[PDB]
Protein backbone atom coordinates (compact mmCIF):
# COMPACT_ATOMS: atom_id res chain seq x y z
CA UNK A 1 0.00 0.00 0.00
CA UNK A 2 1.18 3.21 -0.38
CA UNK A 3 3.53 4.29 1.83
CA UNK A 4 6.74 6.65 1.47
CA UNK A 5 9.25 4.94 3.76
CA UNK A 6 11.64 3.88 0.68
CA UNK A 7 13.00 7.33 -0.62
CA UNK A 8 13.69 7.93 3.43
CA UNK A 9 15.03 4.41 4.33
CA UNK A 10 16.71 2.96 1.27
CA UNK A 11 17.53 6.48 0.25
CA UNK A 12 20.67 7.86 -2.00
CA UNK A 13 20.63 11.50 -1.12
CA UNK A 14 21.48 11.64 2.36
CA UNK A 15 22.42 14.98 3.76
CA UNK A 16 24.40 16.32 6.54
CA UNK A 17 22.93 16.68 9.98
CA UNK A 18 23.07 20.34 10.34
CA UNK A 19 20.85 20.32 7.35
CA UNK A 20 18.84 17.39 8.62
CA UNK A 21 16.24 16.69 6.14
CA UNK A 22 12.53 16.71 7.29
CA UNK A 23 9.99 14.45 5.84
CA UNK A 24 6.41 15.06 7.32
CA UNK A 25 4.66 12.17 5.70
CA UNK A 26 1.33 10.70 5.62
CA UNK A 27 1.60 6.56 5.32
CA UNK A 28 -0.12 3.38 3.99
CA UNK A 29 -2.79 1.84 6.11
CA UNK A 30 -4.41 -1.39 5.56
CA UNK A 31 -5.60 -4.34 8.19
CA UNK A 32 -2.08 -5.05 8.93
CA UNK A 33 1.36 -3.71 9.71
CA UNK A 34 3.17 -0.59 8.38
CA UNK A 35 6.84 -1.54 8.23
CA UNK A 36 9.32 -3.97 9.57
CA UNK A 37 11.35 -3.22 12.18
CA UNK A 38 15.03 -4.53 10.32
CA UNK A 39 16.96 -7.16 9.22
CA UNK A 40 20.21 -5.83 8.92
CA UNK A 41 20.72 -2.60 11.06
CA UNK A 42 22.80 -1.57 13.54
CA UNK A 43 21.16 -0.19 16.30
CA UNK A 44 17.47 0.79 16.77
CA UNK A 45 15.95 2.02 19.68
CA UNK A 46 11.88 3.04 20.17
CA UNK A 47 10.57 4.58 23.15
CA UNK A 48 7.24 4.61 24.64
CA UNK A 49 6.34 1.13 22.79
CA UNK A 50 8.87 -1.52 22.10
CA UNK A 51 10.69 -1.50 19.12
CA UNK A 52 9.49 -4.63 17.58
CA UNK A 53 5.84 -3.59 18.08
CA UNK A 54 6.21 0.44 16.39
CA UNK A 55 2.36 -0.43 15.05
CA UNK A 56 0.76 -0.25 18.42
CA UNK A 57 -0.37 3.43 18.07
CA UNK A 58 -1.85 5.10 14.88
CA UNK A 59 -0.15 8.43 14.59
CA UNK A 60 -1.70 11.74 13.27
CA UNK A 61 1.65 12.79 11.71
CA UNK A 62 5.65 12.01 11.81
CA UNK A 63 8.64 13.77 10.97
CA UNK A 64 11.46 10.74 10.16
CA UNK A 65 14.86 13.72 10.19
CA UNK A 66 17.39 11.79 8.04
CA UNK A 67 21.18 12.37 8.59
CA UNK A 68 24.24 10.34 8.87
CA UNK A 69 26.70 10.70 12.08
CA UNK A 70 29.49 8.43 13.63
CA UNK A 71 28.80 5.40 15.01
CA UNK A 72 29.17 5.85 18.93
CA UNK A 73 27.22 9.09 18.08
CA UNK A 74 24.21 7.55 17.84
CA UNK A 75 24.27 7.15 21.73
CA UNK A 76 23.86 11.06 21.88
CA UNK A 77 20.86 11.01 19.84
CA UNK A 78 18.62 9.33 22.64
CA UNK A 79 16.87 11.39 24.46
CA UNK A 80 18.23 12.46 28.05
CA UNK A 81 21.86 12.64 27.15
CA UNK A 82 23.43 15.53 26.11
CA UNK A 83 26.33 14.69 23.93
CA UNK A 84 27.56 17.18 20.97
CA UNK A 85 24.51 16.17 18.25
CA UNK A 86 21.76 16.75 21.18
CA UNK A 87 23.06 20.30 21.83
CA UNK A 88 23.81 22.05 19.08
CA UNK A 89 22.70 19.57 15.75
CA UNK A 90 20.14 17.53 16.83
CA UNK A 91 18.07 17.22 20.29
CA UNK A 92 15.41 15.46 21.16
CA UNK A 93 13.18 16.24 23.54
CA UNK A 94 13.95 14.93 27.39
CA UNK A 95 10.31 13.37 27.51
CA UNK A 96 9.81 11.62 24.05
CA UNK A 97 8.19 8.63 22.41
CA UNK A 98 9.38 7.93 19.13
CA UNK A 99 12.00 5.84 17.41
CA UNK A 100 15.70 6.03 16.66
CA UNK A 101 17.79 3.40 13.28
CA UNK A 102 21.04 3.68 12.29
CA UNK A 103 22.33 1.48 9.61
CA UNK A 104 26.01 1.04 8.65
CA UNK A 105 26.96 3.13 5.71
CA UNK A 106 30.92 2.47 4.94
CA UNK A 107 29.45 0.51 2.00
CA UNK A 108 28.34 3.97 0.26
CA UNK A 109 29.28 7.21 1.85
CA UNK A 110 32.66 6.45 2.32
CA UNK A 111 35.07 7.73 -0.71
CA UNK A 112 38.36 6.27 -0.16
CA UNK A 113 40.97 8.66 0.39
CA UNK A 114 38.07 11.15 2.58
CA UNK A 115 35.16 12.10 1.63
CA UNK A 116 33.94 15.56 2.73
CA UNK A 117 30.67 15.82 1.57
CA UNK A 118 29.19 15.46 5.00
CA UNK A 119 29.07 18.48 7.48
CA UNK A 120 28.01 19.09 11.16
CA UNK A 121 27.29 22.59 13.12
CA UNK A 122 30.28 21.79 15.29
CA UNK A 123 29.98 25.29 17.18
CA UNK A 124 26.99 27.30 18.01
CA UNK A 125 26.26 29.88 20.54
CA UNK A 126 24.18 28.10 23.15
CA UNK A 127 22.07 24.53 23.01
CA UNK A 128 18.74 24.43 20.83
CA UNK A 129 15.56 23.88 21.90
CA UNK A 130 14.00 20.67 20.36
CA UNK A 131 13.90 20.42 16.33
CA UNK A 132 14.94 24.08 15.18
CA UNK A 133 17.28 23.56 11.83
CA UNK A 134 20.18 26.04 12.71
CA UNK A 135 21.03 26.17 8.61
CA UNK A 136 22.69 29.55 9.07
CA UNK A 137 26.29 29.01 8.42
CA UNK A 138 26.61 32.49 9.91
CA UNK A 139 30.53 32.80 10.92
CA UNK A 140 30.19 32.35 14.95
CA UNK A 141 31.57 34.49 17.23
CA UNK A 142 33.41 33.51 20.22
CA UNK A 143 34.19 36.15 21.73
CA UNK A 144 34.20 40.32 21.73
CA UNK A 145 34.71 41.06 18.01
CA UNK A 146 32.21 40.78 15.39
CA UNK A 147 33.84 40.04 12.09
CA UNK A 148 31.91 41.56 9.74
CA UNK A 149 31.42 37.46 8.74
CA UNK A 150 35.07 36.62 8.16
CA UNK A 151 37.25 33.40 9.65
CA UNK A 152 39.74 34.74 12.18
CA UNK A 153 41.53 34.01 15.39
CA UNK A 154 37.40 34.22 17.26
CA UNK A 155 35.44 33.59 13.85
CA UNK A 156 34.81 29.98 13.28
CA UNK A 157 33.34 28.30 10.29
CA UNK A 158 30.10 26.31 11.79
CA UNK A 159 29.82 23.49 10.37
CA UNK A 160 32.60 21.12 9.79
CA UNK A 161 33.32 17.60 8.59
CA UNK A 162 33.63 13.58 9.20
CA UNK A 163 35.83 12.84 6.51
CA UNK A 164 35.03 9.21 6.15
CA UNK A 165 37.74 6.53 5.09
CA UNK A 166 36.86 3.10 4.38
CA UNK A 167 38.93 1.78 6.89
CA UNK A 168 37.80 3.29 10.06
CA UNK A 169 36.63 1.66 13.15
CA UNK A 170 33.62 -0.21 13.70
CA UNK A 171 32.44 2.70 15.97
CA UNK A 172 33.61 5.26 12.75
CA UNK A 173 31.89 4.19 10.00
CA UNK A 174 29.17 6.57 8.82
CA UNK A 175 25.98 5.26 10.45
CA UNK A 176 22.99 6.77 8.44
CA UNK A 177 20.24 7.11 10.88
CA UNK A 178 16.62 8.53 10.47
CA UNK A 179 14.87 9.13 13.49
CA UNK A 180 10.94 9.17 13.82
CA UNK A 181 9.49 12.01 15.92
CA UNK A 182 5.99 11.28 16.69
CA UNK A 183 3.71 14.43 17.04
CA UNK A 184 0.85 14.40 19.21
CA UNK A 185 -0.74 17.04 17.39
CA UNK A 186 -5.10 16.69 17.80
CA UNK A 187 -6.25 15.66 14.40
CA UNK A 188 -7.39 12.80 12.31
CA UNK A 189 -5.19 10.54 12.61
CA UNK A 190 -3.06 9.10 9.34
CA UNK A 191 0.15 6.90 9.82
CA UNK A 192 -0.07 3.79 11.15
CA UNK A 193 -0.72 -0.03 10.09
CA UNK A 194 -3.60 -2.40 11.09
CA UNK A 195 -7.20 -1.42 11.40
CA UNK B 1 39.48 3.68 22.27
CA UNK B 2 42.71 3.49 22.82
CA UNK B 3 45.68 5.62 20.99
CA UNK B 4 49.56 4.10 22.03
CA UNK B 5 52.28 6.22 20.57
CA UNK B 6 55.30 4.42 19.11
CA UNK B 7 58.13 4.50 20.15
CA UNK B 8 58.37 4.59 23.53
CA UNK B 9 61.41 7.72 23.26
CA UNK B 10 62.79 9.32 20.58
CA UNK B 11 66.24 11.07 20.90
CA UNK B 12 67.43 13.36 17.74
CA UNK B 13 70.37 16.09 17.29
CA UNK B 14 69.67 20.29 16.82
CA UNK B 15 68.92 19.93 12.82
CA UNK B 16 67.68 17.13 12.39
CA UNK B 17 64.11 15.39 11.06
CA UNK B 18 61.51 12.83 13.44
CA UNK B 19 58.97 11.05 13.14
CA UNK B 20 56.46 10.06 15.80
CA UNK B 21 54.27 7.29 15.38
CA UNK B 22 51.16 7.45 16.93
CA UNK B 23 48.72 4.39 16.42
CA UNK B 24 45.09 3.40 17.40
CA UNK B 25 43.68 0.13 18.96
CA UNK B 26 41.26 0.29 15.95
CA UNK B 27 41.82 2.22 12.85
CA UNK B 28 40.25 5.70 12.39
CA UNK B 29 39.42 8.51 10.13
CA UNK B 30 42.37 11.15 10.16
CA UNK B 31 39.66 14.57 10.85
CA UNK B 32 40.09 14.32 14.42
CA UNK B 33 43.15 12.75 15.54
CA UNK B 34 45.46 16.15 16.85
CA UNK B 35 49.15 16.50 18.08
CA UNK B 36 50.04 19.00 21.28
CA UNK B 37 53.36 19.59 22.30
CA UNK B 38 53.58 19.61 26.28
CA UNK B 39 56.90 21.43 27.64
CA UNK B 40 58.14 20.00 30.79
CA UNK B 41 55.64 21.60 33.69
CA UNK B 42 53.66 24.01 31.20
CA UNK B 43 50.50 23.72 29.53
CA UNK B 44 50.52 21.85 26.98
CA UNK B 45 49.94 23.80 23.40
CA UNK B 46 48.50 22.77 20.11
CA UNK B 47 50.79 21.77 17.11
CA UNK B 48 48.41 19.59 14.87
CA UNK B 49 44.93 20.08 14.00
CA UNK B 50 42.52 17.80 11.76
CA UNK B 51 45.33 14.87 10.48
CA UNK B 52 48.11 17.26 9.21
CA UNK B 53 46.46 20.81 9.43
CA UNK B 54 48.98 23.24 10.56
CA UNK B 55 47.42 25.49 13.43
CA UNK B 56 47.76 29.58 13.97
CA UNK B 57 51.62 29.95 14.51
CA UNK B 58 52.35 26.30 13.97
CA UNK B 59 56.08 26.49 11.58
CA UNK B 60 56.32 25.23 8.67
CA UNK B 61 58.25 22.64 10.24
CA UNK B 62 56.14 20.44 11.51
CA UNK B 63 53.90 18.22 9.30
CA UNK B 64 51.12 15.37 9.63
CA UNK B 65 51.01 12.04 7.65
CA UNK B 66 49.23 8.98 7.71
CA UNK B 67 45.71 7.60 8.17
CA UNK B 68 43.76 4.97 9.60
CA UNK B 69 46.45 2.41 11.98
CA UNK B 70 48.59 5.26 12.03
CA UNK B 71 49.67 8.87 11.58
CA UNK B 72 52.90 10.45 12.23
CA UNK B 73 54.39 14.25 13.43
CA UNK B 74 57.28 15.16 11.54
CA UNK B 75 59.98 17.69 11.98
CA UNK B 76 62.29 18.36 8.87
CA UNK B 77 65.06 21.08 10.88
CA UNK B 78 65.33 20.51 14.39
CA UNK B 79 65.68 23.44 16.99
CA UNK B 80 65.63 23.01 21.05
CA UNK B 81 62.33 25.12 21.61
CA UNK B 82 60.66 22.01 19.57
CA UNK B 83 61.90 19.43 21.89
CA UNK B 84 59.37 18.72 24.37
CA UNK B 85 56.82 15.99 24.82
CA UNK B 86 54.42 15.01 21.68
CA UNK B 87 50.87 14.02 22.92
CA UNK B 88 48.59 12.41 19.94
CA UNK B 89 44.66 12.65 21.20
CA UNK B 90 42.24 11.62 18.88
CA UNK B 91 38.92 13.18 19.99
CA UNK B 92 36.55 10.25 19.56
CA UNK B 93 33.61 11.28 22.59
CA UNK B 94 36.38 12.96 24.34
CA UNK B 95 39.72 13.27 24.07
CA UNK B 96 42.15 9.86 24.55
CA UNK B 97 45.91 10.98 24.71
CA UNK B 98 49.26 9.08 24.18
CA UNK B 99 51.20 8.07 26.65
CA UNK B 100 53.30 10.61 25.17
CA UNK B 101 56.86 10.46 23.65
CA UNK B 102 59.71 12.72 25.16
CA UNK B 103 61.79 13.65 22.81
CA UNK B 104 65.26 14.07 23.66
CA UNK B 105 69.01 15.26 22.23
CA UNK B 106 71.25 12.28 20.74
CA UNK B 107 74.69 12.52 22.99
CA UNK B 108 77.71 10.70 22.95
CA UNK B 109 76.46 7.90 25.52
CA UNK B 110 78.40 8.48 29.20
CA UNK B 111 78.97 6.51 31.37
CA UNK B 112 76.76 6.79 35.18
CA UNK B 113 79.04 7.22 38.14
CA UNK B 114 77.64 5.76 41.57
CA UNK B 115 78.02 7.19 45.29
CA UNK B 116 77.35 6.23 48.45
CA UNK B 117 75.40 8.03 51.55
CA UNK B 118 74.06 6.00 54.11
CA UNK B 119 72.21 7.41 56.78
CA UNK B 120 74.14 7.52 60.76
CA UNK B 121 72.99 8.29 64.55
CA UNK B 122 71.36 11.76 63.66
CA UNK B 123 68.77 9.93 61.15
CA UNK B 124 69.12 6.40 63.41
CA UNK B 125 67.60 8.06 66.43
CA UNK B 126 64.42 9.02 64.66
CA UNK B 127 64.33 5.40 64.55
CA UNK B 128 64.33 5.26 60.23
CA UNK B 129 67.24 4.67 58.10
CA UNK B 130 67.77 5.93 54.27
CA UNK B 131 71.24 4.59 52.20
CA UNK B 132 71.45 7.11 49.55
CA UNK B 133 72.49 5.64 45.94
CA UNK B 134 73.63 7.96 43.03
CA UNK B 135 74.15 8.30 39.68
CA UNK B 136 75.25 11.62 38.05
CA UNK B 137 75.14 12.72 33.98
CA UNK B 138 74.43 9.95 32.44
CA UNK B 139 72.98 8.91 28.98
CA UNK B 140 70.51 7.80 27.92
CA UNK B 141 67.39 6.65 30.82
CA UNK B 142 67.58 3.30 30.09
CA UNK B 143 69.52 2.66 33.29
CA UNK B 144 69.50 -0.66 35.61
CA UNK B 145 69.94 0.01 39.37
CA UNK B 146 69.29 -2.36 42.12
CA UNK B 147 70.35 -2.94 45.84
CA UNK B 148 72.09 -6.16 47.08
CA UNK B 149 72.00 -5.94 50.77
CA UNK B 150 73.20 -9.81 51.47
CA UNK B 151 73.18 -9.88 47.62
CA UNK B 152 69.57 -10.58 48.16
CA UNK B 153 66.29 -8.75 46.67
CA UNK B 154 65.89 -5.60 48.25
CA UNK B 155 62.91 -5.13 45.76
CA UNK B 156 59.71 -2.42 47.16
CA UNK B 157 62.00 -1.17 49.72
CA UNK B 158 63.83 1.52 47.41
CA UNK B 159 62.28 4.45 46.11
CA UNK B 160 63.93 5.77 42.23
CA UNK B 161 64.29 9.46 41.29
CA UNK B 162 66.16 10.68 38.63
CA UNK B 163 66.18 14.42 37.40
CA UNK B 164 64.82 15.58 34.22
CA UNK B 165 66.60 16.22 30.86
CA UNK B 166 69.08 18.82 31.80
CA UNK B 167 67.92 21.72 29.42
CA UNK B 168 71.94 22.78 29.13
CA UNK B 169 73.59 19.59 28.27
CA UNK B 170 70.82 16.87 28.12
CA UNK B 171 71.97 14.46 30.91
CA UNK B 172 70.15 12.60 33.40
CA UNK B 173 71.28 12.45 37.17
CA UNK B 174 69.78 9.85 39.27
CA UNK B 175 69.41 8.16 43.05
CA UNK B 176 67.58 5.35 45.46
CA UNK B 177 66.79 5.37 48.71
CA UNK B 178 66.14 2.41 50.92
CA UNK B 179 63.11 2.84 53.93
CA UNK B 180 64.59 0.73 57.10
CA UNK B 181 64.27 0.94 60.37
CA UNK B 182 67.19 1.25 63.08
CA UNK B 183 66.95 -2.86 63.76
CA UNK B 184 66.76 -3.19 59.81
CA UNK B 185 69.79 -1.37 60.12
CA UNK B 186 71.56 -3.06 62.48
CA UNK B 187 70.79 -6.32 61.70
CA UNK B 188 72.25 -6.87 58.71
CA UNK B 189 76.42 -5.87 57.36
CA UNK B 190 77.07 -5.30 53.90
CA UNK B 191 75.38 -2.92 51.90
CA UNK B 192 75.64 -2.58 47.92
CA UNK B 193 73.79 -0.80 44.93
CA UNK B 194 74.78 -2.11 41.32
CA UNK B 195 74.11 -0.40 38.30
CA UNK B 196 74.33 -1.31 34.56
CA UNK B 197 73.92 1.03 31.55
CA UNK B 198 74.40 1.20 28.31
CA UNK B 199 77.24 3.46 28.87
CA UNK B 200 79.43 0.75 30.43
CA UNK B 201 80.18 -2.80 29.75
CA UNK B 202 80.22 -4.01 33.37
CA UNK B 203 78.04 -3.95 36.62
CA UNK B 204 79.48 -1.33 38.20
CA UNK B 205 78.85 -2.15 42.49
CA UNK B 206 79.15 0.27 45.53
CA UNK B 207 79.71 -1.75 48.87
CA UNK B 208 80.52 -1.26 52.07
CA UNK B 209 80.03 -3.17 55.68
CA UNK B 210 77.97 -1.22 58.57
CA UNK B 211 79.29 0.96 60.66
CA UNK B 212 82.55 1.23 58.74
CA UNK B 213 83.16 5.14 57.29
CA UNK C 1 46.38 39.83 24.89
CA UNK C 2 44.47 36.64 25.28
CA UNK C 3 44.42 33.99 28.21
CA UNK C 4 42.28 32.14 30.84
CA UNK C 5 43.00 32.91 34.47
CA UNK C 6 44.11 29.60 36.53
CA UNK C 7 44.27 30.01 39.93
CA UNK C 8 43.01 28.16 43.25
CA UNK C 9 45.48 25.27 44.41
CA UNK C 10 44.24 22.71 46.55
CA UNK C 11 45.92 21.30 49.30
CA UNK C 12 42.85 18.38 50.77
CA UNK C 13 42.14 15.18 52.69
CA UNK C 14 40.29 12.59 51.19
CA UNK C 15 36.50 12.92 50.22
CA UNK C 16 36.51 16.55 50.75
CA UNK C 17 35.70 19.52 48.65
CA UNK C 18 37.65 21.72 46.82
CA UNK C 19 37.40 24.51 44.43
CA UNK C 20 39.32 26.00 41.36
CA UNK C 21 39.07 28.86 39.18
CA UNK C 22 39.18 29.83 35.65
CA UNK C 23 38.71 33.51 33.79
CA UNK C 24 38.83 33.75 30.39
CA UNK C 25 40.38 37.17 28.42
CA UNK C 26 38.59 37.34 25.13
CA UNK C 27 37.26 34.48 24.98
CA UNK C 28 33.42 34.49 26.26
CA UNK C 29 33.52 30.84 28.66
CA UNK C 30 29.53 30.96 27.75
CA UNK C 31 30.47 30.53 24.29
CA UNK C 32 32.88 27.65 24.06
CA UNK C 33 34.05 23.99 24.94
CA UNK C 34 35.66 24.46 27.98
CA UNK C 35 37.48 21.46 29.44
CA UNK C 36 39.83 20.81 32.25
CA UNK C 37 42.07 18.11 31.99
CA UNK C 38 44.60 16.85 35.01
CA UNK C 39 48.09 15.86 34.49
CA UNK C 40 48.71 12.73 37.38
CA UNK C 41 52.24 13.24 38.84
CA UNK C 42 54.76 12.69 35.97
CA UNK C 43 52.57 10.51 34.66
CA UNK C 44 50.47 10.55 31.68
CA UNK C 45 47.74 13.62 30.76
CA UNK C 46 44.20 12.22 31.58
CA UNK C 47 41.20 14.65 30.33
CA UNK C 48 39.16 15.33 33.02
CA UNK C 49 35.89 17.11 31.83
CA UNK C 50 34.26 19.85 29.30
CA UNK C 51 31.73 22.06 29.78
CA UNK C 52 29.77 22.99 26.76
CA UNK C 53 29.28 26.37 25.19
CA UNK C 54 25.54 25.47 26.49
CA UNK C 55 25.52 24.18 30.30
CA UNK C 56 26.31 20.47 29.64
CA UNK C 57 29.42 18.68 31.23
CA UNK C 58 31.06 15.45 30.29
CA UNK C 59 33.31 14.16 32.73
CA UNK C 60 35.85 11.26 32.54
CA UNK C 61 34.98 7.93 33.09
CA UNK C 62 37.48 7.81 36.22
CA UNK C 63 35.93 11.09 37.46
CA UNK C 64 32.29 10.50 37.05
CA UNK C 65 30.02 12.07 39.23
CA UNK C 66 32.27 12.93 41.59
CA UNK C 67 33.14 16.34 40.25
CA UNK C 68 31.36 19.43 38.99
CA UNK C 69 32.27 21.84 36.26
CA UNK C 70 30.38 25.21 36.66
CA UNK C 71 30.04 28.50 35.20
CA UNK C 72 29.53 31.94 35.78
CA UNK C 73 29.09 34.10 32.86
CA UNK C 74 28.23 37.70 34.52
CA UNK C 75 32.09 37.34 35.61
CA UNK C 76 32.94 35.23 32.89
CA UNK C 77 34.50 31.95 35.17
CA UNK C 78 34.82 28.59 35.29
CA UNK C 79 34.48 26.74 38.36
CA UNK C 80 35.97 23.18 39.11
CA UNK C 81 34.00 22.24 42.44
CA UNK C 82 36.18 18.80 43.32
CA UNK C 83 33.65 16.48 45.76
CA UNK C 84 34.83 13.59 47.66
CA UNK C 85 38.06 12.63 46.43
CA UNK C 86 41.03 10.34 46.22
CA UNK C 87 44.40 9.83 46.86
CA UNK C 88 45.38 9.47 43.48
CA UNK C 89 43.99 12.32 42.28
CA UNK C 90 46.65 14.62 43.09
CA UNK C 91 47.81 16.24 39.82
CA UNK C 92 47.94 19.70 37.92
CA UNK C 93 44.79 20.84 36.42
CA UNK C 94 44.76 22.81 33.30
CA UNK C 95 41.52 24.75 32.05
CA UNK C 96 41.87 24.90 28.41
CA UNK C 97 39.37 26.17 25.10
CA UNK C 98 38.43 23.48 22.90
CA UNK C 99 37.49 23.33 19.43
CA UNK C 100 37.31 19.63 19.04
CA UNK C 101 38.25 19.68 15.16
CA UNK C 102 40.68 22.10 15.94
CA UNK C 103 41.90 20.83 19.28
CA UNK C 104 42.09 22.38 22.94
CA UNK C 105 44.07 25.84 21.10
CA UNK C 106 43.76 27.89 24.75
CA UNK C 107 45.34 26.32 28.15
CA UNK C 108 45.49 27.36 31.42
CA UNK C 109 48.45 28.06 33.38
CA UNK C 110 47.25 24.75 35.46
CA UNK C 111 47.19 24.93 39.71
CA UNK C 112 48.04 21.68 41.68
CA UNK C 113 45.94 19.95 43.53
CA UNK C 114 47.03 17.44 46.36
CA UNK C 115 44.52 14.74 47.84
CA UNK C 116 46.04 12.94 50.77
CA UNK C 117 44.90 11.42 54.21
CA UNK C 118 48.29 12.47 55.54
CA UNK C 119 48.42 16.50 57.05
CA UNK C 120 50.65 19.64 57.07
CA UNK C 121 54.23 18.50 58.62
CA UNK C 122 57.38 19.94 58.36
CA UNK C 123 60.65 18.59 57.03
CA UNK C 124 63.81 16.90 58.47
CA UNK C 125 67.20 17.52 57.36
CA UNK C 126 69.58 15.01 57.15
CA UNK C 127 73.21 15.52 55.50
CA UNK C 128 74.39 13.74 52.75
CA UNK C 129 78.29 13.98 53.50
CA UNK C 130 80.66 12.36 50.63
CA UNK C 131 83.44 10.17 51.21
CA UNK C 132 85.61 8.20 48.87
CA UNK C 133 83.15 6.43 47.14
CA UNK C 134 82.36 10.53 45.44
CA UNK C 135 85.98 11.40 44.29
CA UNK C 136 87.13 10.53 41.32
CA UNK C 137 88.31 13.75 39.03
CA UNK C 138 87.53 16.04 42.28
CA UNK C 139 83.38 15.29 41.10
CA UNK C 140 82.88 15.51 45.07
CA UNK C 141 79.13 14.39 45.32
CA UNK C 142 77.36 15.95 48.35
CA UNK C 143 73.22 16.39 49.29
CA UNK C 144 71.13 16.66 52.24
CA UNK C 145 67.89 14.74 52.48
CA UNK C 146 64.10 15.74 52.79
CA UNK C 147 62.82 13.56 55.04
CA UNK C 148 58.74 13.08 56.01
CA UNK C 149 57.90 16.53 54.95
CA UNK C 150 54.35 17.37 53.67
CA UNK C 151 53.36 18.67 51.35
CA UNK C 152 54.73 19.72 48.00
CA UNK C 153 56.56 22.05 47.00
CA UNK C 154 59.39 22.95 48.92
CA UNK C 155 62.52 24.68 47.71
CA UNK C 156 66.31 23.68 47.96
CA UNK C 157 69.13 26.06 47.23
CA UNK C 158 72.54 26.05 48.54
CA UNK C 159 75.09 28.24 49.75
CA UNK C 160 72.44 30.10 51.11
CA UNK C 161 70.71 30.46 47.98
CA UNK C 162 73.88 31.56 45.87
CA UNK C 163 74.68 28.29 44.07
CA UNK C 164 72.07 27.29 41.65
CA UNK C 165 73.96 25.91 38.99
CA UNK C 166 76.11 22.27 39.04
CA UNK C 167 72.95 21.58 41.47
CA UNK C 168 71.00 18.39 41.27
CA UNK C 169 67.18 18.51 42.93
CA UNK C 170 65.98 14.90 42.61
CA UNK C 171 61.90 15.69 42.55
CA UNK C 172 60.17 14.45 46.01
CA UNK C 173 58.17 11.17 45.72
CA UNK C 174 55.46 9.82 47.84
CA UNK C 175 56.06 6.46 49.64
CA UNK C 176 54.09 4.44 51.33
CA UNK C 177 53.89 6.02 54.80
CA UNK C 178 52.05 8.85 52.46
CA UNK C 179 54.87 11.65 54.58
CA UNK C 180 56.62 13.60 51.35
CA UNK C 181 60.53 13.16 51.16
CA UNK C 182 63.38 14.50 48.58
CA UNK C 183 66.97 14.70 48.51
CA UNK C 184 69.59 17.39 46.64
CA UNK C 185 72.64 17.09 45.72
CA UNK C 186 75.76 19.04 44.24
CA UNK C 187 79.40 18.62 43.09
CA UNK C 188 82.43 20.38 44.29
CA UNK C 189 85.71 19.81 44.19
CA UNK C 190 87.88 17.46 45.88
CA UNK C 191 89.36 20.09 48.16
CA UNK C 192 85.91 21.93 49.04
CA UNK C 193 84.51 18.57 50.44
CA UNK C 194 86.74 18.63 53.61
CA UNK C 195 86.24 22.51 54.41
CA UNK C 196 84.21 25.17 53.11
CA UNK C 197 80.87 27.58 54.21
CA UNK C 198 78.52 24.40 53.37
CA UNK C 199 74.78 25.18 53.75
CA UNK C 200 71.91 23.79 52.24
CA UNK C 201 68.47 25.28 52.78
CA UNK C 202 64.92 24.20 52.71
CA UNK C 203 62.18 25.86 52.64
CA UNK C 204 58.75 24.56 52.76
CA UNK C 205 55.21 27.19 53.02
CA UNK C 206 52.47 25.29 54.29
CA UNK C 207 55.09 24.61 57.29
CA UNK C 208 56.31 27.75 57.01
CA UNK C 209 59.41 25.97 58.45
CA UNK C 210 62.98 28.21 56.46
CA UNK C 211 65.97 25.55 57.93
CA UNK C 212 69.10 27.09 56.37
CA UNK C 213 70.94 23.67 57.81
CA UNK C 214 74.47 23.03 57.85
CA UNK C 215 75.93 19.83 55.69
CA UNK C 216 79.16 18.62 57.40
CA UNK C 217 81.27 15.53 56.78
CA UNK C 218 80.92 12.42 59.44
CA UNK C 219 82.95 9.98 60.77
Known amino acids: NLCPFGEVFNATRFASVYAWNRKRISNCVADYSVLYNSASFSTFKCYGVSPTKLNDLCFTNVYADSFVIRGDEVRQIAPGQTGKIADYNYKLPDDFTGCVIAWNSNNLDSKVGGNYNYLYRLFRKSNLKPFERDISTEIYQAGSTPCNGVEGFNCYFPLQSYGFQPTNGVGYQPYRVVVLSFELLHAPATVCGPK | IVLTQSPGTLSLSPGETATLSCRASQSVGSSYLTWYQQKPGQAPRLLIYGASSRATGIPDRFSGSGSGTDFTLTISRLEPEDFAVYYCQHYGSSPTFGQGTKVEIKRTVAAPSVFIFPPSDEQLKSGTASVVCLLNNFYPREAKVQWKVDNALQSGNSQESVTEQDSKDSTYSLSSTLTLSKADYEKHKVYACEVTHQGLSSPVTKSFNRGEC | ?219
Not at chain 3, 20 to 40: D, K
Not at chain 3, 51 to 66: L, N, Q
Not at chain 3, 77 to 94: F, G, I, K, P
Open chain 3, 1 to 219: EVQLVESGGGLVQPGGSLRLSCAASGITVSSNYMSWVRQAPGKGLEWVSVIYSGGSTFYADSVKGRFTISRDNSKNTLYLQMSSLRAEDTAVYYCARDLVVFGMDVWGQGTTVTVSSASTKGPSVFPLAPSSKSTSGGTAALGCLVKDYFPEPVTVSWNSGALTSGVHTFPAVLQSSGLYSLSSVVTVPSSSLGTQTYICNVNHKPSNTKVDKRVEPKS
